[PDB]
Amino acid sequence: VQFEENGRKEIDIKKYARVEKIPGGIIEDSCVLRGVMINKDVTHPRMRRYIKNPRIVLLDSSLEYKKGESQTDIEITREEDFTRILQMEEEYIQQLCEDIIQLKPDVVITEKGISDLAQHYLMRANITAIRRVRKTDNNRIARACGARIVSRPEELREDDVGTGAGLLEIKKIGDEYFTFIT
Amino acid sequence: NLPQLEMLKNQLDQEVEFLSTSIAQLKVVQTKYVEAKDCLNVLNKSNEGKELLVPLTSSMYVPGKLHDVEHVLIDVGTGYYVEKTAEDAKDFFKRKIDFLTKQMEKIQPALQEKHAMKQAVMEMMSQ
Amino acid sequence: TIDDCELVEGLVLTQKVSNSGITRVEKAKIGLIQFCLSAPKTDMDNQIVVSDYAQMDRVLREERAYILNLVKQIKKTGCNVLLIQKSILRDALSDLALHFLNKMKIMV
Amino acid sequence: VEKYQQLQKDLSKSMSGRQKLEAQLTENNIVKEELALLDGSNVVFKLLGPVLVKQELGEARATVGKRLDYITAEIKRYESQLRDLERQSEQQRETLAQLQQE
Amino acid sequence: FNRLRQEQRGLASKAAELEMELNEHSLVIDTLKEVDETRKCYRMVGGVLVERTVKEVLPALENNKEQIQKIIETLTQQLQAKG
Amino acid sequence: FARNTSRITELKEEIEVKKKQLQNLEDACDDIMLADDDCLMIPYQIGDVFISHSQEETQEMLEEAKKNLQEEIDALESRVESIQRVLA
Amino acid sequence: AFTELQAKVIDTQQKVKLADIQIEQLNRTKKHAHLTDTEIMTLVDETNMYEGVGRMFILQSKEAIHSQLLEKQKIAEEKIKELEQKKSYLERSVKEAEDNIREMLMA
Amino acid sequence: DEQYQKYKFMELNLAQKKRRLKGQIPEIKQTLEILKYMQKKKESTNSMETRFLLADNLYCKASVPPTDKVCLWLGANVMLEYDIDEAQALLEKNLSTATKNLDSLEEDLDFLRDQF
Amino acid sequence: SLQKTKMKLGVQVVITDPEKLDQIRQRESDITKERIQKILATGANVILTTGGIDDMCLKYFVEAGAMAVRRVLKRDLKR
């Protein structure tokens, strides 16, 4: 871990890594995962796992279906407006997620809320989204998968976001499954 | 620190409850206008002049044919007159309802938006 | 500036009057005032409930006639501009009475 | 505290009337503002109780304008009582505190 | 306190409101019993105004009590369920 | 028992408002006698009904309301004065 | 900090308290509509009849009663199906957000 | 002791009764004298253009013949119509006699409750 | 900085159009052909642009010759 640099190969503080708190298993065979690893949130796998689809992508976009874009407005007043708003949100979210196909990820990383109309498009496109990651995790996966953290999509392309094949497994040490970016 | 804040939280709760009574007032003010909109459809259906059974104060009913849609009337202000004309009685009290409903939006939108901070104060009070 | 200072006969004072032909008046009759030009005032500005929506109108419609008689008396006095005393020890002045006394070209 | 409570009561009974007049005024403003331009569909009369008399727009305008001036004057009256209350809140409230202290 | 209080209050009120409705439907019977609702009359049921001889009023005004009575008795017995 | 205030204050205020209403009714009578004094059409209300027919027929209820107000209200003013004097 | 994310999850709970109210209001009003429909189907057996909004009664014939017992109840019907197609959306909005917040944010 | 609190509670829960009762009294008055003063003579005389309530905010012009028919409701289910002479006879008791008991159960009840 | 994404001013996503949501950037890129014609008429053959402009957007001006240079910052802008 020296690709991050200030003129020359230089690693930053332990925050650039992350410890793990499994009470189960045995201390005699404990080790450290090759790459980034997501914990203390994952307990069951996504509905598509053990598949290998390259070029991991990561976002911080408020991709939730709502009245506004980054904020929630007052309750709907024009009762007919909902029919229009559902279609406009569907088209808008699909247009945003179209450029996710430019990378064809297996796991989408979203700090803000991934949305069901986005996740339906992703599963139709054989893509999955992991949600509720921390701020440091954005940089963690960005470095691990060979990407820069980008807030909102369509500013992404292969070998500049993500490198190589996305090969991830979710398995349990103890009673809880954990996401392992292997 | 904590004790004085908890003591004043009772006054905060009482003012929030007063504003909650205000929003209950908000739910109870729409009525007059909502049955006004419901009674819209009577006007156009009876513009030839038609027999009506109508209340006198609240509890009385007396038969009588409505006529003269050209001076249908609404009360306003300190004793001023709103003489609704015939064509208005068919179609234009729809926009009059639109404006009364606009005042109804002064009630619901423009007061729920400022009671958003009321609910925010409720959420903050947990600290 | 400093050089534009001057000696002035009579009086010069800050603005009060508006929309009363404020451009200029010849032989402006100036009248001192130390008496009220508004509705009577008490614990409230009225002697009835401030929520008697139908009633303040029906009483101040003749209170307006009263202040109109006052300003008409000022007119028959022959005034052109008025000189009103310090305010705090007195009730305020009704700006509508000012509006009426404007139309026959009298300032305050 | 006597003076603070008296000024609080004055504030309350002035603001109740001010708020009720605001509640009716928010409606009369619009009603009259389209009424001044929708002539023919409505015509100005006075419903002064259980009777009707033909009425002209100008005296209604004068009435609403002097409502506005009256209520603004009442607003400054109320807010002056507010400064009076906050001024008494120091010393008229220290009246008891200083007698309990010494 | 609260986790029991609001549950009991809601389950009581859900039929206390219908008990008040039965109170209204029982105080309304005075017209039929003594005010002589027997002639040819323009009877209304809310929203509708029927000119009919009042034959159905007795079954209609008994069918509401025959249900709401057992509803309110069930509420009264449910009040004793847990203390 | 010094119950006078609880039994005279409301009567005084209601007599005052009824006198104001009677004065306003007299003002309305005067107004219909000079403002919109047109014989041909005049909406005049008896309870919950307009009839735009009465010009001189308006007094048929103007006097009725006048006396039914004034006699009852000054009789009840004597009543509240009686409530005052029975205690003092 | 997680304070604003916690604000969002409490906002989702507030939206749940919106959801239950917005479905229960319409299901009670629909029950009232069914009661009115049963009453109107019962009372059509007689002819000389009046309807209105309560504050008035307009005379008609029987075919007008047949027309009115359908033309407004069918609007309430189309509106109830609108409110299921809205409630499903908003209940998805609250429930899936819960599914992705409760076992996720505690990390 | 508890005397003050219970006295205030009784005063409140009886003043609410006062407010409610003199709440329904004015409109039942109106029901009596409006009809008995205008209609009983003029409507029985000749048919005129009239004003009737369409709603409590929508007021519509009307005309009435000598219909002389009146209807009373005490609830959402039970109706009876009457002539223009017996209707006021049945209505006049409902206030003229009702005031004597309800208001004596108000004025005299207050006189007692000042000690009760 | 013309962008496919709402990182800078001028880009919006509230529009209710599956096309316009994307081709607002394309329309702006086609309009900027007028701007590069203007800079060529003034005398410039390269235009520098602050951060947030897409490299594919730079291609549009590279093809026309009036190429665009990315990554100039606020201190560069003020200088």
- To the nearest whole Å, the CA of B66 is away from the closest chain A CA by 34
CA separation for the pair C50, C46 (Å, rounded)? 7
Q: Which long-range contacts (CB under 8 A, 24 or more apart) does G85-90 make?
A: G86/A82, G87/G19, G87/G22, G87/G23, G89/A82, G89/A86, G90/G15, G90/G18, G90/G19, G90/G22
Neighbours of B78 (CB within 10 A): 20
Rg, Å, chain H Cα set:
20
CA separation for the pair D10, C15 (Å, rounded)? 33
Q: Which long-range contacts (CB under 8 A, 24 or more apart) does E15-24 make?
A: E15/E71, E15/E72, E15/E74, E15/E75, E16/E75, E18/E68, E18/E71, E18/E72, E19/E68, E19/E71, E19/E72, E19/E75, E21/E68, E22/E64, E22/E65, E22/E68, E22/E69, E22/E72, E24/H75
**H or E element that contains B34:** helix B2-45
Are the CB atoms for F44 and H50 separated by under 8 Å? no
Cα torsion angle, A132, A134, A138, A140, sign: negative
- To the nearest whole Å, the CA of B76 is away from the closest chain C CA by 11
- 3-state SS of chain C is CCCCCCCCCCCCCCCCCCCCCCCCCCCCCEEEECCCCCCCCCCCCCCCCCCCHHHHHHHHHHHHHHHHHHHHHHHHHCCCEEEECCCCCCCCCCHHHHHHHHHCCCCC
DSSP annotation of B91: I
Is B60 close to H49, i.e. CB distance below 8 A?
A: no
For the domain covering B1-126, report its CATH number. 1.10.287.370
Q: Is residue A56 part of a domain?
A: yes
Quick check: helix, strand or coil at residue B54? Answer: strand
Quick check: helix, strand or coil at residue A60? Answer: coil
Strand A57-59, strand A107-110: pairing: parallel
Nearest to I53 by CA among A22, A155, C102, A8: A155
- Taking the CA of residue D68 as centre, how many other CA atoms within 13 Å lie in the half-sphere pointing to its CB? 11
Are the CB atoms for H62 and F56 separated by under 8 Å? no
How many whole angstroms from its chain centre is CA C3?
Answer: 36
Place of tokens 């470095």: A143
Quick check: helix, strand or coil at residue I22? Answer: helix
Place of tokens 């997680």: G2
Are the CB atoms for D18 and C44 separated by under 8 Å? no
- Chain H positions touching G55 (Cβ under 8 A) are 53-56
Are the CB atoms for B36 and H55 separated by under 8 Å? yes
- To the nearest whole Å, the CA of C53 is away from the closest chain D CA by 7
Distances (CA, A) of A161 to A142, A143, A156, A157, G63: 8, 10, 6, 6, 70
Are the CB atoms for D81 and D7 separated by under 8 Å? yes
Is A74 close to B113, i.e. CB distance below 8 A?
A: yes
- Chain D positions touching B92 (Cβ under 8 A) are 41
Q: What is the dihedral of CA E53, E59, E60, E65, to 10 degrees?
A: 150
Q: Does G89 touch chain A (CB under 8 A)?
A: yes
Pairs across F and H, CB distance < 8 A: 39
Nearest to D89 by CA among D32, D33, D7: D7
Are the CB atoms for B51 and B63 separated by under 8 Å? yes
Are the CB atoms for A72 and A123 separated by under 8 Å? no
Give the neighbours of chain G: at least 3 Cβ pairs within 8 Å: A, B, E, H
What are the DSSP calls for chain F, one per residue?
---HHHHHHHHHHHHHHHHHHHHHHHHHHHHHHHTT--SS---EESSS-EETT-SSTTHHHHHHHHHHHHHHHHHHHHHHHHHHHHH-
Count the residues in chain D.
Answer: 102
Place of tokens 């209204």: E24
- To the nearest whole Å, the CA of F45 is away from the closest chain D CA by 5
Residue type for B20, please?
A: S
Quick one: angle between helices G62-71 and G3-43, nearest 10? 160
DSSP annotation of A99: G
Strand E40-44, strand E48-53: pairing: antiparallel
Are the CB atoms for F53 and H48 separated by under 8 Å? yes
Nearest to A133 by CA among A36, A23, A47: A36
> Which segments within B7-70 are labelled E, that is strand?
50-55, 60-66
In chain E the first and final C-alpha atoms are separated, in Å, by 12
CA separation for the pair H71, H46 (Å, rounded)? 20
CA separation for the pair A38, A133 (Å, rounded)? 8
> Which segments within chain A are labelled E, that is strand?
37-38, 57-59, 107-110, 128-131, 169-172, 177-180
Quick check: helix, strand or coil at residue B40? Answer: helix
Chain E residue with CA closest to G62: the answer is: E50
Residue type for C101, please?
A: L
Nearest to C79 by CA among C15, C28, C25: C28
What are the DSSP calls for H5-55, one per residue?
HHHHHHHHHHHHHHHHHHHHHHHHHHHHHHIIIIIHHHHHH--EEEEEESS
Give the resolution to one decimal, in Å.
3.8
Residue type for G42, please?
A: T
DSSP annotation of B57: S
CA separation for the pair F49, H70 (Å, rounded)? 15
- Chain H positions touching E37 (Cβ under 8 A) are 78-80
Is D67 close to C92, i.e. CB distance below 8 A?
A: no
Q: Does F60 touch chain D (CB under 8 A)?
A: no
Choose among E46, E48, E51: nearest Cβ to G48: E51
CA separation for the pair D17, D71 (Å, rounded)? 9
Nearest to B41 by CA among A62, A52, C93, H55: H55
Q: Which long-range contacts (CB under 8 A, 24 or more apart) does F24-30 make?
A: F24/C54, F24/C58, F24/D48, F24/D49, F25/D49, F25/F62, F25/F65, F25/F66, F25/F69, F26/F66, F27/C58, F27/D48, F28/D48, F28/D49, F28/D51, F29/F58, F29/F59, F29/F62
Structure tokens at A99: 């450029």
Nearest to F25 by CA among F83, F55, F57, F64: F64
Are the CB atoms for H27 and F39 separated by under 8 Å? no
- Chain F positions touching H53 (Cβ under 8 A) are 48
Cα torsion angle, E16, E18, E24, E30, sign: negative
Going by C-beta distance under 8 Å and a sequence separation of 6 or more, which residues neighbour residue H76? E28, E44, E45, E46
- Taking the CA of residue B76 as centre, how many other CA atoms within 13 Å lie in the half-sphere pointing to its CB? 24
- To the nearest whole Å, the CA of H73 is away from the closest chain G CA by 12
Is A77 close to B113, i.e. CB distance below 8 A?
A: no
Is B81 close to D30, i.e. CB distance below 8 A?
A: no
- Chain D positions touching F25 (Cβ under 8 A) are 49
Quick check: helix, strand or coil at residue H114? Answer: coil
Nearest to H57 by CA among A42, C5, B97, C78: B97
Q: What is the dihedral of CA D5, D10, D11, D12, to 10 degrees?
A: 90
CA separation for the pair D18, D73 (Å, rounded)? 10
Distances (CA, A) of D52 to C72, D47, F27, F59: 32, 5, 13, 15
Quick one: angle between helices D57-101 and C53-77, nearest 10? 100
Neighbours of A85 (CB within 10 A): 17
DSSP annotation of D39: B
C–I touching, 3+ CB–CB pairs within 8 Å: no
CA separation for the pair D41, D35 (Å, rounded)? 9
Structure tokens at H93: 């008791």
Burial state string for C19-45 with b = 16 or more CB within 10 A and e = fewer than 16: ebeeeeeeeeeeeeeeeebbbeeeeeb
CA separation for the pair G73, G86 (Å, rounded)? 20
CA separation for the pair A64, A92 (Å, rounded)? 11
Neighbours of A139 (CB within 10 A): 18
Distances (CA, A) of C83 to C10, C13, C17, C36, C58: 13, 11, 11, 12, 32
- To the nearest whole Å, the CA of A8 is away from the closest chain G CA by 33
Burial state string for D7-21 with b = 16 or more CB within 10 A and e = fewer than 16: bbebbebbbebbeeb
- Taking the CA of residue H4 as centre, how many other CA atoms within 13 Å lie in the half-sphere pointing to its CB? 1
Distances (CA, A) of B76 to D102, H59, H108: 62, 12, 41
- Chain F positions touching H49 (Cβ under 8 A) are 50-53
CA separation for the pair A70, G70 (Å, rounded)? 44
Strand B72-76, strand B80-84: pairing: antiparallel
Are the CB atoms for D80 and D31 separated by under 8 Å? no
Is D52 close to F27, i.e. CB distance below 8 A?
A: no
Q: Does B46 touch chain A (CB under 8 A)?
A: no
Place of tokens 């009630």: B107
**H or E element that contains B73:** strand B72-76
CA separation for the pair B19, B5 (Å, rounded)? 20
Q: Is residue A132 part of a domain?
A: yes
Nearest to A3 by CA among A145, A105, A103, A107: A145
Is A95 close to I22, i.e. CB distance below 8 A?
A: yes
Picking from G17, G38, G43, G44 by the largest number of E CB atoms within 10 A of its own CB, the best residue to mutate is G43
Largest Cα span, chain C: 60
Choose among D30, D31, D47: nearest Cβ to B79: D47
- Chain H positions touching F6 (Cβ under 8 A) are 110
- Chain A residues contacting G via beta carbons under 8 Å: 39-41, 43, 64-65, 72, 75, 79, 82, 86, 113-114, 116, 131-132, 134
CA separation for the pair A155, I52 (Å, rounded)? 9
- To the nearest whole Å, the CA of F30 is away from the closest chain H CA by 22
CA separation for the pair E73, B10 (Å, rounded)? 39
Place of tokens 């790459």: A35
CA separation for the pair C26, C20 (Å, rounded)? 14
Rg, Å, chain E Cα set:
18
Is G100 close to A113, i.e. CB distance below 8 A?
A: yes
H–B touching, 3+ CB–CB pairs within 8 Å: yes
Quick check: helix, strand or coil at residue A167? Answer: strand
- Chain B positions touching C53 (Cβ under 8 A) are 78
- Chain F positions touching C54 (Cβ under 8 A) are 24
- Chain H positions touching B61 (Cβ under 8 A) are 70-73
Count the residues in chain C.
Answer: 108
Residue type for I60, please?
A: Y
CA separation for the pair E67, C45 (Å, rounded)? 61
Q: Does B1 touch chain F (CB under 8 A)?
A: no
CA separation for the pair C54, D48 (Å, rounded)? 9
Nearest to F72 by CA among F14, F4, F31: F14
Residue type for G16, please?
A: V
Q: Return the ∠ at Cα A34 (arms to A32 and A39), rounded to 5°.
A: 65
- Chain A positions touching I3 (Cβ under 8 A) are 155
- Chain C positions touching D24 (Cβ under 8 A) are 53
Picking from D47, D63, D66 by the largest number of B CB atoms within 10 A of its own CB, the best residue to mutate is D47
Quick check: helix, strand or coil at residue B62? Answer: strand
Are the CB atoms for F30 and F14 separated by under 8 Å? no
CA separation for the pair C5, B52 (Å, rounded)? 83
Are the CB atoms for C21 and C108 separated by under 8 Å? no
User: What region, left, alpha or beta, does residue G51 occupy, with left being phi > 0 and alpha being psi -120 to 50 degrees?
Assistant: beta
CA separation for the pair B85, B69 (Å, rounded)? 6
Q: Return the ∠ at Cα C72 (arms to C71 and C73), rounded to 5°.
A: 85
Is I7 close to A92, i.e. CB distance below 8 A?
A: no
CA separation for the pair B40, B97 (Å, rounded)? 9
Choose among I6, I14, I16: nearest Cβ to A152: I6
Distances (CA, A) of H48 to B52, B71, E25, F50, H63: 15, 15, 39, 10, 6
CA separation for the pair C42, D74 (Å, rounded)? 12
Are the CB atoms for G28 and E17 separated by under 8 Å? no
Q: Does C61 touch chain B (CB under 8 A)?
A: no
Q: Does C50 touch chain B (CB under 8 A)?
A: no
Structure tokens at D67: 């409502």
Chain G residues 21-80 within an 8 A CB cutoff of chain A: none
Provide the domain count of chain A.
Answer: 1
Q: Return the ∠ at Cα A47 (arms to A41 and A50), rounded to 5°.
A: 90
- Chain G positions touching A73 (Cβ under 8 A) are none
Q: Which long-range contacts (CB under 8 A, 24 or more apart) does C51-55 make?
A: C51/D16, C51/D17, C51/D20, C51/D21, C53/B78, C53/D20, C53/D21, C53/D24, C54/B78, C54/B79, C54/F24, C55/F20
Pairs across A and B, CB distance < 8 A: 8
- Chain C positions touching F24 (Cβ under 8 A) are 54, 58
- Structural domains in chain D plus CATH codes: 2-101 (1.10.287.370)
Going by C-beta distance under 8 Å and a sequence separation of 6 or more, which residues neighbour residue A77? B105, B108, B109
Neighbours of H9 (CB within 10 A): 11
- To the nearest whole Å, the CA of G44 is away from the closest chain E CA by 9
Going by C-beta distance under 8 Å and a sequence separation of 6 or more, which residues neighbour residue A28? none
Distances (CA, A) of A144 to A18, A161, B110: 13, 11, 49
Largest Cα span, chain E: 57
Give the neighbours of chain C: at least 3 Cβ pairs within 8 Å: B, D, F
Chain B residue with CA closest to G14: the answer is: B119
Are the CB atoms for A116 and G99 separated by under 8 Å? no
Structure tokens at G83: 């409110």
- Chain G positions touching H53 (Cβ under 8 A) are 55
Are the CB atoms for D51 and F55 separated by under 8 Å? no
Going by C-beta distance under 8 Å and a sequence separation of 6 or more, which residues neighbour residue F5? none
Distances (CA, A) of C14 to C11, C17, C83: 10, 10, 13
Distances (CA, A) of G4 to A53, A112, A149, C95, G101: 33, 11, 21, 52, 13
Going by C-beta distance under 8 Å and a sequence separation of 6 or more, which residues neighbour residue H62? B52, B54, B64, B65, B66, B67, B68, H49, H50, H51, H52
